[PDB]
Amino acid sequence: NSNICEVCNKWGRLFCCDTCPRSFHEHCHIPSVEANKNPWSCIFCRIKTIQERCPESQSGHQESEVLMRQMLPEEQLKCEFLLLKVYCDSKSCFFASEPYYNREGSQGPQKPMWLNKVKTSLNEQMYTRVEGFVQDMRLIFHNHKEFYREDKFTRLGIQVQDIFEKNFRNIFAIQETS
Ligand SMILES: [Zn+2]
Ligand SMILES: [Zn+2]
Ligand SMILES: [Zn+2]
């Protein structure tokens, strides 16, 4: 197995996947690495299994249909993995914890949002459809773009949103377009 966490790229107390060479910190994995379970398969392996069980699941989909799906177990897993892929980018640090807003010439957002809040919301089964999760994710970046206005720091929101959106298109097999 790898000797660094797949998500944060640090050593420490690592849990190893039995079906692939990835490793994880307990709370870096989503869901948090399960207490017992031997063998244990990580989220990357669990997603790969879904695909192998239903090869047609990789055919193209419309975003509108994906968003209206109910959060049954497979969709719950896919949103967990998508959240995880965002945390895998080091620029996620900026969006992880609860933000505060005090900048001359800007007003904070009406509905603040952050990764750890989405993480808790998924854990507590608060989203009933994929749309709920995707709306909160996109709101993170939209709030940032609006608040930072012309400061070059706005680019961090663009960058992390692009990671989100590429991974959304991949994980949910969104039909490719120009
Ligand atoms: Zn980690
Ligand atoms: Zn694995
Ligand atoms: Zn099938």
Resolution limit in angstroms? 1.7
Q: Domain 60-178 classified CATH 3.40.640.10?
A: no
Give the integer Cα–Cα distance in Å for 42 and 16: 8
Name the residue with tokens 């660094």. Answer: 4
Phi, psi of 153 (to 5 degrees): -65, -20
User: What is the signed CA dihedral for 11, 40, 164, 79, rounded to 10 degrees?
Assistant: -140
Which ligand lies nearest to the CA atom of residue 48 in the structure? 2
CA of 2 to the centre of ligand 3 (A): 32
CA of 56 to the centre of ligand 3 (A): 6
Phi, psi of 158 (to 5 degrees): -60, -45
Could you state, in order of their start, the residue ranges of all structural domains in the chain? 1-59, 60-178
- Give all strands (DSSP E) within the chain, no chain letters: 14-16, 23-25
Identify the CA nearest to 1 among candidates 18, 45, 35.
18
| Type of residue found at 31 | P
Which ligand lies nearest to the CA atom of residue 50 in the structure? 3
CA of 25 to the centre of ligand 1 (A): 4
Which ligand lies nearest to the CA atom of residue 6 in the structure? 1
The β-bridge partners of 107 are none
Q: Are 133 and 127 in contact (CB under 8 A)?
A: yes
Give the integer Cα–Cα distance in Å for 114 and 58: 30
Other C-beta atoms closer than 10 Å to the C-beta of 120 total 11
Q: Which fold is adopted by the domain 1-59?
A: Herpes Virus-1 (3.30.40)
Identify the CA nearest to 42 among candidates 32, 54, 51.
32
Helix, strand, coil percentages (3-state) for the chain, rounded to 5, are 50, 5, 45
Using CA atoms, how far residue 120 sits from 17, 52, 66, 82, 126, in Å, is 23, 29, 22, 14, 9
CA of 146 to the centre of ligand 2 (A): 38
Angle, CA 149 vertex, CA 144 and CA 153 arms, to 5°: 60
DSSP state of 14: E
Name the residue with tokens 């998508």. Answer: 82
